[PDB]
């Protein structure tokens, strides 16, 4: 079937321009709007870069960004793959 593509495109370089202590607008400006957040209690930018060509399986890096009460980057979690 056609190639399944899901989430945000992450250029692996755009991930460099982001460092802890940023407001949501800068990350948003440097990574675009996140397709998904956490809609339950907390607030966390979910940047999934999922792509799946047919009969080749999924390649996926997950860039999870945790902001504090005041909408400022406190945690930068990068998973460049899965197993």
């Amino acid at each position: 079937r056609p190639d399944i593509n899901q989430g945000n495109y992450l250029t692996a370089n755009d991930v460099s321009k982001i460092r802890v202590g940023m407001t949501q607008q800068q990350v948003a400006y440097a990574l675009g709007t996140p397709l998904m957040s956490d809609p339950f209690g907390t607030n966390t930018w979910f940047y999934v870069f999922r792509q799946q060509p047919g009969h080749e399986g999924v390649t996926q890096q997950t860039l999870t960004l945790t902001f504090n009460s005041s909408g400022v980057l406190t945690n930068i979690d990068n998973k460049p793959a899965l197993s």
């Binding site: 809609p39 339950f40 209690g41």
Partner: protein, 56 residues
């Protein structure tokens, strides 16, 4: 077309009531939006064929 002649007729329904979802501890359900929200209009009028939809 032919399906509408059945609705324009009189057929009625009684479907899934509305039950509010609980919120576990250490989290919360998302926001209300409020677009699709039905007020509690009190009382009883005739419903489903019992109601006279003839023009007053």
């Amino acid at each position: 077309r032919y399906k509408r002649q059945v609705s324009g007729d009189e057929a009625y329904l009684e479907a899934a009531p509305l039950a509010e979802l609980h919120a576990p501890a250490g989290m919360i359900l998302p926001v209300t939006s409020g677009d699709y929200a039905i007020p509690v209009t009190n009382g009883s009028g005739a419903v489903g064929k019992a109601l006279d939809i003839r023009p007053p």
